[PDB]
Every structure is written in structure tokens, then in C-alpha cells.
């Protein structure tokens, strides 16, 4: 199996996480689940940045030690990801010795190589300085040879113009004004600053410089680092320069999605425009929360949350469009055939030829959207197919057909096409929604996991034997 390595940024637990953080982790999970469905050996990482004066200050104010405070915050963050059914293979913490060892070794290496020198940085304090300008041509050469490195492509030309063209100043990579962080082994009054400390989580979590580097040699380089747009230059400039200084392979892609806005702009702990994901999940369910996030933030753009948009998106798309379609279909199979779904024979009805083609066009277009990080376009395309399936009930009028015994075969064809249309949608929604597809597969009585995979969508009409649907249907949402 080809490997695929995906990461979110490590988040700062100076306060509780809100749906902005949730977006990145769900988006990372959508990509991870999608890539596992394509047959990749996937590793998916997330974590926490646990150092700096600010974390020590929060712990003191809470009347706790730094790790005591951090363990409670991280417990809540882990609980949240377990609630969101995030499929992360590991959780990296910068307080862990596996991480601290790498920060220590990397800082001492750069010191030995002459990359780092002692100096002074009113903000007036001593710091080690990283000579990054000597990697400039190498970085710009790498951009030329990897034109899809920054996503969206717009932000690459901002990097070069705003930060590189003026010239990369020597980066201050340590401080002496705080003590909560990784102390430099050579010179312990210095503490490693955020730049080296936070960035190396992506490789420290894979056991880089440990006695077992198997995860590192299997998964590095990262296929995709995802983030919000404001930490892209860390990741586009400083990160590959550090990787050059360590003679390490650079990541393939950095994706910088937009922000989840509120009425007053960016969702943030400091604007007091926070929506707690726990609340949305507890009231409206997991799928509604996951769906809203991925559907409402387009590629290369920002999106806005309002309570009115949320319930609209939840009720119209999930509960009505997909939800009624499933109930309508299972009702009719139970009423006209006593729960026995007739086997698919072929495109018997006149609309079936184009609807079957539409199903395959839906899969192909979905694939293109997913491969180009256009998640909202992928979802909207699946909903056009769901809408058309509801419309196919209205066009065919199965209740009229059920009165003529001569049209029993045609009526069975219509039932089969609804269930197969539903099946196509359920397979395609598996990366996004973790409850509804499984609920749909169980209610239609698809136990075999061969019906739930992407390769089962290559040819329309996989059910040639008659099967029995559920006699006691239920709502799929919340
Ligand atoms: C209102 N909040 C505040 O006062 C605050 C806000 C953030 C604060 C903070 C205090 N203290 C720190 C801090 C200080 C020293 C050490 Br050692 C450390 O580990 C953290 N930060 C960090 C938070 N880390 C973070 O967001 O990691 C993202 C990331 C993930 C993966 C790879 C790379 C980067 C911070 C510091 C400087 C920044 O840029 C100038 C910055 O911009 C993103 C963030
Ligand atoms: N509004 C948001 N939209 C999208 N992603 C976000 C948002 N808020 C946080 N994130 C995710 O978390 C990462 C770090 O976010 P950031 O430091 O801006 O959040 P914060 O907790 O709101 O900070 P602060 O209140 O100090 O400004 C981003 O790179 C992104 O992965």
C-alpha cells in the first residue's frame, strides 16, 4: 500500500477549542477517511502546543501545575475528537519526552553546524539566531519544481513577494525571559521558542531520532499539512528551511483553508464569538456538525456560521433531502413488495439511462473535487444526485404503478434504482458522515462491506439478487 500522511496544526490550549479548530480536524479526517477508502496506508496526526509563558500563566491562575493544567485541557480536547469521531492515529504533545528529545537534538545540531549563533534581540533579551537567508535560492528553486506546493496557489506568490523578496532576516529561535519550555542543553537559561518547538511535532511523533524510526521512514514526507491561512509562512518558509538544515525531505503540499466567520468576522477566543462544538453535537447530532463545517467553507475562501444557516443546512439537506428519500423508499418497498426489494435487472424505465450515467458522473466529479481539496463542491454535487433521486420518485409515481399488476416489473425497477441511488450517496458520504451511511446500510440490509467501498460504484446496479429491507424503519438523523 502507498502511504499517505496528513496533519493538522498543533493547537494552543490557552482556552477551550471552538468550531474553528473543529473545522481543521474534521477536514483532516475527511481526507484521511477518503484516502483509506482509496486503499492508502494512512497516518493522521493532530496535537497540542503546550509550551510558552502563556500556558504557565493559565496553570498558575487555575491553581495547578503546568502538566496538571495541560492534562485536563488535553483530556477535554481528546474527548472532543472522540466525540467528533476523528480517526487520528496518534496525538502529539510537546510536553512528551519523544518530542522534547527531538527539539533538543535538532537545536544542538543547528548549533554545531553554525546555523544558530548567540546574540541579542522595548523587547530586549538574549536569543539564539537562525541564519535562514542562505537557504533562499534553494527554497525558491523548490517552489519552481513544485508549483502545487502551496494551496491555494494564490498564497505562494504572496510568500515570495511579502517575506522572501525583502529578504529573510535571521530568525530569533530562543528566549531567556520565560522558563516553561524546552531548555537548550548547551545553554539552559535559553528556552527553545515556538518556531522549532511547534514545527518538529510532525516528525517527532513519527519517532525521528529515536531508536525506532519506522513510522518516520514509512510516512515522512507529509503529503499534506493543513492549517488556517495565518500560519502558512511558518509552514511554507521556515519549516522547509529547517528541513533543509537537517537534510530532510520537504513536505509535498501545504493547504491553507479559510476561516469560519461569525457575524463580527473570524471565530476566535479573543473576539468572544465562540461556538462550542460540544453544544452543536449534543443538540443536533454529530453528522449535522460535521456536515455544516465541510459544506460551508469553500476552497480559497472564508465562510460564515449563523444559527439560522445551521438549522437550515441540517434540516433541508440531511433530514429532508437524504432523510425523507430513505424513508420514502423503504416505505414503498415494505408496502408494495412486503419488504422484498426486487433485484436490479437494467435501465428498464426511460429515465434510467441518464440517471445511471448521472450516478457515474457524480462519482467522477466528486473524485475531482476531493482530489483538488474542494470539499463543499464535492458535497453539493452529491446533493444534486440526492435531489434528483427524490425527483425520480415524483416523475415515476410508484403508487400509480402499484395499482397495475402488469407494471409490477417496472415498479420493481423503480425501487431498485432508488436503493442503488441511495447506495451511491451513502458510499460517497462515508468520509464526511460517520453515522448516517452506516444507518442507511443497516436499514437497507447491506451487511457485506463490499457494497460500502468506492470500487463498488464503478458499474451501476450491483444488487442482482432480491434482498429484504428493514420492516421497522427509523429516522436516520440526528
Ligand atoms: C492571546 N493569546 C496569546 O497571548 C498567545 C497566543 C499564541 C501563543 C502564545 C500566547 N504563547 C505562545 C508560545 C510561546 C512560546 C512557545 Br516555546 C510556545 O510553544 C508557544 N504562542 C504560540 C502558539 N503556537 C501556535 O499557534 O502554534 C501553531 C503552530 C502549529 C504547528 C506548527 C507551527 C506552528 C505562538 C507564538 C508566536 C506566534 O507567531 C508570532 C504564533 O502564531 C501562530 C503562535
Ligand atoms: N476560525 C477558524 N477558522 C478556521 N480554522 C481555525 C479557526 N480558528 C482556529 N482554527 C484552526 O486552529 C489553528 C490555530 O488557530 P488560532 O491560533 O487562530 O486560534 P485561536 O484559539 O482562536 O486564537 P486566538 O484567540 O489567540 O486568536 C488554525 O491554523 C486552524 O487550523
Curated annotation (Swiss-Prot):
E.C. numbers: 6.1.1.10
GO biological process, one term: methionyl-tRNA aminoacylation
Broad class of where this protein is predominantly found: cytoplasm
Broad enzyme group: ligase
Residues reported to bind ATP: 269
Transmembrane spans: none
Domain of life of the native organism: Bacteria
Keyword Transcription: no
A GO term, aspect molecular function: methionine-tRNA ligase activity
Motif ('HIGH' region): 11-21
Placement of sequence motif 'KMSKS' region: 266-270
Catalytic reactions on record: tRNA(Met) + L-methionine + ATP = L-methionyl-tRNA(Met) + AMP + diphosphate
Gene Ontology CC terms, in alphabetical order: cytoplasm
Coiled-coil parts of chain: none
Family as reported in the entry's similarity comment: Belongs to the class-I aminoacyl-tRNA synthetase family. MetG type 2B subfamily.
Self-association and partners: Homodimer.
Functional note: Is required not only for elongation of protein synthesis but also for the initiation of all mRNA translation through initiator tRNA(fMet) aminoacylation.
Official protein name in the record: Methionine--tRNA ligase
Gene from which this protein is expressed: metG
Residues of the full protein shown: 3 to 520 of 657
Amino acid at each position: 500500500k502507498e502511504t499517505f500522511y496528513i496533519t493538522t496544526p498543533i493547537y494552543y490550549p490557552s482556552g477551550n477549542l471552538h468550531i474553528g479548530h473543529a473545522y481543521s480536524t474534521v477536514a483532516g479526517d475527511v481526507i484521511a477517511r477518503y484516502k483509506r477508502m482509496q486503499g492508502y496506508d494512512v497516518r493522521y496526526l493532530t496535537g497540542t502546543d503546550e509550551h510558552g509563558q502563556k500556558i504557565q500563566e493559565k496553570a498558575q491562575k487555575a491553581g495547578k501545575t503546568e502538566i496538571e493544567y495541560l492534562d485536563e485541557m488535553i483530556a477535554g480536547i481528546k474527548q472532543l475528537w472522540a466525540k467528533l469521531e476523528i480517526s487520528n492515529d496518534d496525538f502529539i504533545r510537546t510536553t512528551e519526552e519523544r518530542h522534547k528529545h527531538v527539539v533538543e537534538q535538532v537545536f544542538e545540531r543547528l548549533l554545531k553546524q553554525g546555523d544558530i549563533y548567540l546574540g541579542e534581540y522595548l523587547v530586549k533579551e538574549e536569543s539564539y539566531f537562525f541564519n535562514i537567508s542562505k537557504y533562499t535560492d534553494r527554497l525558491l528553486e523548490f517552489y519552481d519544481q513544485n508549483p502545487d506546493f502551496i494551496q491555494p496557489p494564490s498564497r505562494k506568490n504572496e510568500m515570495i513577494n511579502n517575506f522572501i523578496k525583502p529578504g529573510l532576516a535571521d530568525l530569533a529561535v530562543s528566549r531567556t525571559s520565560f522558563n516553561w519550555g524546552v531548555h537548550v542543553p548547551s545553554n539552559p537559561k535559553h528556552v527553545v521558542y515556538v518556531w522549532i518547538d511547534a514545527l518538529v511535532n510532525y516528525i517527532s511523533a513519527l519517532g525521528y531520532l529515536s531508536d525506532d524510526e519506522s513510522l518516520f521512514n514509512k510516512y515522512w514526507p507529509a503529503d499534506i499539512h493543513l492549517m488556517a491561512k495565518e500560519i502558512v509562512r511558518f509552514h511554507s518558509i521556515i519549516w522547509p528551511i529547517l528541513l533543509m538544515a537537517l537534510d530532510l525531505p520537504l513536505p509535498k503540499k501545504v493547504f491553507a483553508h479559510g476561516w469560519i466567520l461569525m457575524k463580527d468576522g473570524k471565530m476566535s477566543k479573543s473576539k468572544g464569538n465562540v461556538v462550542d462544538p460540544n453544544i452543536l453535537i449534543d443538540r443536533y447530532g454529530l453528522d449535522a456538525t460535521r456536515y455544516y463545517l465541510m459544506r460551508e467553507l469553500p476552497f480559497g475562501s472564508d465562510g460564515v456560521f449563523t444559527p439560522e444557516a445551521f438549522v437550515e443546512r441540517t434540516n433541508f439537506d440531511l433530514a429532508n433531502d437524504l432523510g425523507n428519500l430513505v424513508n420514502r423508499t423503504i416505505s414503498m418497498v415494505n408496502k408494495y413488495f412486503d419488504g422484498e426489494l426486487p433485484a436490479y435487472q437494467g435501465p428498464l424505465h426511460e429515465l434510467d439511462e441518464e440517471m445511471e450515467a448521472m450516478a457515474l458522473e457524480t462519482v467522477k466529479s466528486y473524485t475531482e473535487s476531493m482530489e483538488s481539496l474542494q470539499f463543499s463542491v464535492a458535497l453539493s454535487t452529491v446533493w444534486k444526485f440526492i435531489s434528483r433521486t427524490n425527483k425520480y420518485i415524483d416523475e415515476t409515481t410508484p403508487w400509480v404503478l402499484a395499482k397495475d399488476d402488469s407494471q409490477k416489473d417496472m415498479l420493481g425497477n423503480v425501487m431498485a434504482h432508488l436503493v442503488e441511488n441511495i447506495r451511491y450517496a451513502a458510499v460517497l458520504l462515508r468520509p464526511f458522515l460517520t453515522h448516517a451511511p452506516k444507518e442507511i446500510f443497516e436499514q437497507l440490509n447491506i451487511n457485506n462491506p463490499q457494497f460500502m467501498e468506492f470500487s463498488s460504484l464503478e458499474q451501476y446496479g450491483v444488487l442482482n439478487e432480491s434482498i429484504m429491507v428493514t420492516g421497522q424503519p427509523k429516522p436516520i438523523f440526528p
